[PDB]
Each structure stands twice: as structure tokens, then as C-alpha cells.
């Protein structure tokens, strides 16, 4: 179990850690989060009480270093930092725990939700999507645009998701225009899986990361990416059986976790109706279809 200490909490803020969240008052004696499960990536996120504009946060893996949060009164935000003095860090953490100034990561033992949402998400792949190689953790916020959005503005502050575009020369072989547009198996299996992602785990990891950025930061370009990666699979007549079964599980847990009140803005009616009811895979996503029809029958 690892710890992310906080130097202090000078401004009132709602703090998220993965799917959990809690409020900290201005100058409340709060010194961080303990008992963080080792073995998963995690996200710590922030919404200031005085400006619920700009949610922002940091993806990190406690196995890659000792990380802490410190408010910066010049830049006006809670910053993640790495402490290289491991003795200093262990000392600080021990003092804050003995004083009980930390919230405990509140995982129930029956609960695999976070694993199920991050199963294929790797810190190394996050750092390729979010380029800032001087840090081992990755900053994301609500406003960051994707490389595809920048094509359709600061490159250093962008989400470098894999560009998926169904009406593109990459997606469509000459002489197979109708075939490849109506059945995207070529684009999924040869271009994307074999060529770019190399395996389905990396594809699923990007899909999972895009969903989590959409949900935690309301990041629009991430939502676009998540839906495009679902639609590419659902619009392909030839998909490995194990990928379809895994996708059904991935989407089930995403739909299960989604705040009921955000479904109207985080779920694309067209993509989901197409995927569940018209596409090649309309009968292959049994768990996802059942939770969607029972939780969000309006959308359908």
C-alpha cells in the first residue's frame, strides 16, 4: 500500500482518487492519501471550489517513484512532484500517518471496479499519449485537445491518441472502397491491431484511458476517442472472439461506473444504437446491452 502525501491544502478543493472523491476545506489540516493499492495505475484529480471550471489531475503509478502534492500559489494549482530523497519521503509520510492526517484509499475487498476499468492501462502507454518525459506522472485536464482535434492548438499540451478516421486513405484500400467502409475489419485488424497497436491489450488500454479521461475530466476529445474505438470494433465483421468477449466486459464496467447524471453528455446516442442494434456485433455484447437497456433506455 503506497502513499501520496500533501504538503498542505491552502484552497478549498474536491479531490478525486480513482473513482472516489472527497472535499477539503480551505486550510483544512489534510496531508494526503494512504493505502493506495500497488499494482494499478491511479489518477488523483482536483476541482477547485471557487472555479468548478478546469478539472485537472495526474496519472501515476506508485511503483515508479515517490510522489507528493504541493499547492503552487503562483500557478494556482495542486502540483504533483517527485521526491528523490527516499529517506526524507519515508520520514515525512510516517509523521503524517502517526498524526492521522490522511484519508485512506477506501477499497472494499469484494470490489474489482478499479481493476476492471484499468486492466489494460499502462503508465508507459499513458506517457506516450501525454508527452512530458521529464516527469514519471502525467497531467491531464478538461480542456486539453487531441491531435485529431488539432488537425480539425499547443502541441506540447495535447492528447496524442491514435488517430482513427473512417473516411481516410488509411482506413480504405483502393479497390475495396465499399467493402472496407461497410466492414472495417481491414482497418481494425491489419492497420490498427497488427500495424499500430501490435496487440489487443494496447488497443484496449487506450480505449480505457480515453474513457477515464472523459469521465473524470469531462474531456471531449477523449470521449470522441473512446466512441471511435468502440465503433471500429463494432463495425468490423471479423473480430477475434476473445476481443469481443473482453470488450463486452470493458464496456459493462464503464457503463456501470458512469455517473447516472452524466449519461446525456458522455454517451453518443448514434454510436451506441448503431453498435448495439445495427452493427456486425449487435448480438455479441450481451452484458453491455443488458446494462445499457436497464440503466439508459432513454438513450436507446
Amino acid at each position: 500500500m503506497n502513499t501520496v502525501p500533501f504538503t498542505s491544502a491552502p484552497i478549498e478543493v474536491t479531490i478525486g482518487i480513482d473513482q472516489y472523491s472527497f472535499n477539503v476545506k480551505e486550510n483544512q489540516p489534510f496531508h494526503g492519501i494512504k493505502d493506495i493499492p500497488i499494482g494499478h495505475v491511479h489518477v488523483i484529480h482536483f476541482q477547485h471550489a471557487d472555479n468548478s471550471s478546469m478539472r485537472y489531475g495526474y496519472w501515476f503509478d506508485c511503483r515508479m517513484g515517490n510522489f507528493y502534492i504541493q499547492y503552487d500559489p503562483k500557478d494556482g494549482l495542486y502540483k504533483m512532484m517527485e521526491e528523490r530523497d527516499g529517506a526524507k519521503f519515508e520520514n515525512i509520510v510516517h509523521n503524517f500517518k502517526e498524526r492521522q492526517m490522511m484519508v485512506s484509499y477506501p477499497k472494499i475487498d469484494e470490489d474489482d471496479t478499479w481493476y476492471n476499468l484499468t486492466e489494460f492501462v499502462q503508465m508507459d502507454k499513458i506517457r506516450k499519449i501525454v508527452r512530458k518525459d521529464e516527469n514519471q506522472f502525467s497531467y491531464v485536464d478538461s480542456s486539453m485537445t487531441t491531435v485529431q482535434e488539432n488537425e480539425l492548438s499547443d502541441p506540447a499540451h495535447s492528447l496524442n491518441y491514435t488517430v482513427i478516421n473512417f473516411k481516410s486513405r488509411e482506413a480504405i484500400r483502393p479497390g475495396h472502397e465499399m467493402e472496407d467502409f461497410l466492414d472495417k475489419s481491414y482497418y481494425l485488424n491489419t492497420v490498427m491491431l497488427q500495424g499500430i497497436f501490435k496487440n489487443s491489450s494496447n488497443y484496449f488500454g487506450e480505449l480505457q484511458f480515453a474513457f477515464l479521461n472523459a469521465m473524470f475530466f469531462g474531456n471531449y476529445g477523449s470521449s470522441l476517442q473512446w466512441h471511435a474505438m468502440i465503433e471500429l470494433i463494432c463495425s468490423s465483421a471479423t473480430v477475434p472472439k476473445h476481443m469481443l468477449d473482453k470488450l463486452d466486459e470493458i464496456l459493462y464496467y464503464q457503463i456501470k461506473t458512469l455517473p447516472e447524471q452524466y449519461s446525456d453528455i458522455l454517451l453518443n446516442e448514434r454510436v451506441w444504437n448503431i453498435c448495439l442494434y445495427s452493427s456486425f456485433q449487435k448480438n455479441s455484447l450481451h452484458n453491455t446491452e443488458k446494462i445499457m437497456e436497464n440503466k439508459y433506455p432513454e438513450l436507446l
Binding site: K167, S168, R169, I172, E177, M178, F181
Partner: protein, 237 residues
């Protein structure tokens, strides 16, 4: 975006553009089988690709052999249309390629966009104009070349005959739309109007009769009457 009543002089500016109509590509007769079921028999069709400024018509004849052993023919027909338009564009010298292609039916947008991905600078646009180009097969010489075809074939026509010697393209295209709309609304009446006077003939190299300017004014009035007439007989007015 879409072409409508606001931007119609755009059709007659000096940016090369083509209309594409696919309504006569896939044509069938429906009949009863010996067992009393129903079946279709395809007949030859055509893509109607028209430059509205010059009158040049690229009539790609679609021979029924292209459907042999294919499924979902109404869907295939849109993609075959887009394939042939793409081939036509590729066949033209760069300075003759269109800057825009306007499809008469929105279902042609994705097929054509996908076939034209190599030409990112050619705009593919719909129109809110309900253009009567389906009636092109009511022009006798076009119907004849389509039905006589025994293989795929492209035939070039000027659908304005020599009218541009005397009138603008805007006026020629308005006249063509009036004629085709009439032929679509009441083909028999329209053809009697066009052909009732035996002293006015169709030249061998033309599609329509050799009306004088004053005769065109008369013909055009008779076509408006017809479209109004049938509109009464239809809506009881």
C-alpha cells in the same frame, strides 16, 4: 455544404462542377414467377453526370451484367456510381477536373467521398434543389442508347444542344429543368408538346427540337401549363 435557392448562380460561375444523379443506375421490372412469387429483372441503367455551365453530359451506361451475382443491389448501385464518377474524374486532365461534385441524393455523399479520398480538394456537396434528372430516360435518344447497350459504355452529349449560342447557362439549365420536370409529371403530354409540330425536327446531333427563340417561349409556356394542369388533376384544385 448544401446547394439551394440562395446559392444557385454558383452553378454558372467558372469553377468546374458536376451534378451526379444516380436515380437511373439500378432499374428493374417487377413480375410474377410461374409459382406466383414476385421477382425482379434488371434492365440497363445510366449515371447522369452533368456540367451545368457547359451542358456536357457524361452518360455512363450501366449494363445489367454489373449486377450479376451481387447482393444488396440498391446499396451497390450507389458505390458503383461513385466508382464510375471517380474513374471519370481520374480520366480528365487536371485542369478539367471538377472543383465540386453535387449529388442529387444525400445517400451518395459517403460513397462518393470515400471513392474521392485521393482528391481532398474536390468538394462533395448535397443540394436542397429537387432536380428532375430522373426524367433523363424520357429523352428518346438517351433512353435508346441505354437500352441498346450490350456492354458498359460512356456516351457524351451536350444536353443543351446549341442553346448556349443564344442564351446563358442559367437560362439553359432553367429551361432543361422545366422540360425534365414536365416529362416527369406527365411524360405523354410533355412529349406531344415537344413533337406535335412535324415541321420542327430534332437534328441528328441534338436531343431536342430546333425551336426558334419565339417557339421556345411558346413551348416553355405550354410546359408550365402542363405542370399546373397535372397539379390540379392531382390535388383536385
Amino acid at each position: 455544404g448544401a446547394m439551394n435557392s440562395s446559392n444557385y448562380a454558383e452553378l454558372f460561375n467558372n469553377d468546374i462542377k458536376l451534378f451526379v444523379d444516380d436515380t437511373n443506375v439500378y432499374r428493374v421490372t417487377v413480375h410474377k414467377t410461374f409459382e406466383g412469387n414476385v421477382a425482379t429483372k434488371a434492365i440497363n441503367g445510366c449515371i447522369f453526370t452533368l456540367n451545368p455551365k457547359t451542358g456536357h453530359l457524361f452518360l455512363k451506361i450501366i449494363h445489367t451484367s454489373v449486377w450479376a451475382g451481387q447482393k444488396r443491389l440498391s446499396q451497390l448501385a450507389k458505390w458503383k456510381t461513385a466508382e464510375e464518377v471517380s474513374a471519370l474524374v481520374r480520366s480528365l486532365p487536371k485542369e478539367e477536373q471538377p472543383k465540386q461534385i453535387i449529388v442529387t441524393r444525400k445517400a451518395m455523399l459517403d460513397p462518393l467521398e470515400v471513392h474521392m479520398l485521393d482528391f481532398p480538394n474536390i468538394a462533395i456537396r448535397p443540394t436542397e434543389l429537387r432536380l428532375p434528372f430522373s426524367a433523363a430516360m424520357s429523352i428518346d435518344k438517351l433512353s435508346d442508347v441505354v437500352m441498346k447497350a450490350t456492354e458498359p459504355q460512356m456516351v457524351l452529349f451536350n444536353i443543351y444542344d446549341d442553346w448556349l449560342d443564344r442564351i446563358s447557362s442559367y437560362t439553359a439549365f432553367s429551361r432543361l429543368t422545366l422540360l425534365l420536370r414536365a416529362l416527369k409529371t406527365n411524360e405523354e403530354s410533355a412529349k406531344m408538346i415537344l413533337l406535335s409540330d412535324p415541321t420542327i425536327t430534332i437534328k441528328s446531333y441534338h436531343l431536342w427540337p430546333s425551336f426558334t427563340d419565339e417557339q421556345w417561349i411558346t413551348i416553355e409556356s405550354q410546359m408550365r401549363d402542363l405542370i399546373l394542369t397535372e397539379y390540379g388533376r392531382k390535388y383536385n384544385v
